Amino acid sequence: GNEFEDYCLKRELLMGIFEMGWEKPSPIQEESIPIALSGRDILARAKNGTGKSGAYLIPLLERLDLKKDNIQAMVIVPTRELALQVSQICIQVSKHMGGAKVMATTGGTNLRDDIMRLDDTVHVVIATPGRILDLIKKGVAKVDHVQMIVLDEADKLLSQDFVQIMEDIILTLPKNRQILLYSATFPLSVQKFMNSHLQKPYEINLMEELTLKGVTQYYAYVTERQKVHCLNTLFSRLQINQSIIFCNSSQRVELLAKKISQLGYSCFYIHAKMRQEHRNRVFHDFRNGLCRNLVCTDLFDIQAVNVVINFDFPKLAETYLHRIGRSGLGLAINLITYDDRFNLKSIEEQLGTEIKPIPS
């Protein structure tokens, strides 16, 4: 059916799903889980950032036999950040299963230490392509019991520099391995890989788009000189759990952040003219609730964020959509100078939406 209980998972795994607060299957979960449970390969078109993990980790965990100390399932991802995210979700979902071991290994984890780690039981490996192939070829990661492999964001896994690495990985695995493949896009390389390796895959085309539905949108006619005063008013009236305040330049981000800080606001800031590692650190602290508001440029999923402020109104309708759209939040407020008035109506039309005058 369409309830988690319908999939007849182990009670331990369902308890894991319950404790995640996952009440009803998402559409990608509804489409992926019963087919993957049967053993069929999957070919899925889903956007990046879509909650694919929640779909494929469940049948992966259901497939495990914890009476065996062997690696039995692998998830291959193109970035260190996705590896961390997926392994965390996997560790939480499986926390009732009694002895299930999940390990993440990337170019960003220490190779010596990871090798020592693989001396002990590991059932599930989450990894970047380069690191896991290196580990398999060194004999450290033994993969003759792997019965399932997931490829997440397969287009990035199968780009020019990586296609052979992925091919080599696949050739070390039991020929009958179940494959679950997820991708936003389907270049020739992914098409080739598909044809060679996937076996009559179940096809899923679940492309959730960014939408404005459910987002209340307002604008306020303001001069540039008045913008912080207007911000003062907003943050003295709304209930803000967390907010994101977008500006159109790195210079404006810093100046604003430093200004409102001096005025007693809680904020971090992030923009283009910073080291990436610094950027990641700040964003991670914002997510963990160490400030209330993030001031930033366009660089982009944080549940606590209930208000987005466009302190500078964007030039492009697509930028606007990325700033306040959601896949499937609360309030968006636009500060509009005279010179923004054209883009306001234009972006409104392009996106087929409504941005109402703010209530007094």
């Binding site: 006619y221 912080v228 008013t233 200004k259």
Partner: peptide, 23 residues
Amino acid sequence: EEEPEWFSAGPTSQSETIELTGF
């Protein structure tokens, strides 16, 4: 390029509040 009007000629207190209108 230049330094913003709200940084230089901005408020020196959070209580400096203006009316909100789209009109």
